[PDB]
């Protein structure tokens, strides 16, 4: 097969390639932070990195972070509007390869 948009003589990659955005929350949502213990997301991210950085690929580590934040945290507020709320982090990957912090 042959075409006009593949097998270019000069190899190029997208300027937006190889970026990874680890958002603490879903698009359009508030992000929660405990005034004493820190944000749910950063707390969880550090915990999962400390435990799995020498064992799992980064996306899998971030997936564990998603589960930890989603299951273990729920807001507490005297204001009913902000009470008993949940949060799910949002992994946005434009990476082109697997990423391991170890080798």
């Amino acid at each position: 097969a042959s075409g006009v948009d593949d097998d270019m003589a000069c190899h190029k990659i997208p300027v937006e390639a190889d970026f990874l955005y680890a958002y603490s929350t879903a698009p359009g949502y508030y992000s929660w932070r405990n005034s004493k213990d820190g944000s749910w997301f950063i707390q969880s991210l550090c915990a999962m990195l400390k435990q799995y950085a020498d064992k799992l690929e980064f996306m899998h580590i971030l997936t564990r972070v998603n589960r930890k934040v989603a299951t273990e945290f729920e807001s507490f507020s005297f204001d009913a509007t902000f009470h008993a709320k949940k949060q799910i982090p949002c992994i946005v990957s434009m990476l082109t390869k697997e990423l391991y912090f170890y080798h």
Binding site: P27, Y29, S35, E98
Partner: protein, 147 residues
């Protein structure tokens, strides 16, 4: 040599890379933004965590929108040839696509553009990670009881 697959980023360069932490706790009164109590705990936890992963951690506290842009520009202009990756952690108030400096907003796109494959050649082909702790809007998730 034997078969080479190339399915994972080369992370064995001399340096793992930089981990820039922007920790905005106190905001100018004029902005009407509240202080972010507990963010220092996050900043310290990140510093220790990435330190153990062998990253060159650099922390900055309470940066104005101008200082954020200047910092990012300067960092993107460094020679990252011997670094495997780049990490930037943003801790502040925010809205969709925005991160707040102590005196006003900064488009996340402006920050990340400095690191584009064509603008930071020593990072081309290397993972550029942006960790963002900030609001992306005003919606609240009521959750659902699991069974």
């Amino acid at each position: 040599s034997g078969i080479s697959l190339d399915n994972s980023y080369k992370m064995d360069y001399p340096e793992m890379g930089l981990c820039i932490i922007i920790n905005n706790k106190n905001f100018h009164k004029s902005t009407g933004m509240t202080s972010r109590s507990g963010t220092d705990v996050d900043a310290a936890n990140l510093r220790e965590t990435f330190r153990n992963l062998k990253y060159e951690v650099r922390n900055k506290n309470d940066l104005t929108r101008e200082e954020i842009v200047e910092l990012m520009r300067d960092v993107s202009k460094e020679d990252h040839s011997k670094r495997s990756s780049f990490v930037c952690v943003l801790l502040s108030h925010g809205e969709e696509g925005i991160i707040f400096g102590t005196n006003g907003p900064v488009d996340l796109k402006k920050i990340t553009n400095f690191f584009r494959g064509d603008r930071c050649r020593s990072l081309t082909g290397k993972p550029k990670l942006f960790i963002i702790q900030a609001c992306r809007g005003t919606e609240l998730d009521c959750g659902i009881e699991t069974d």
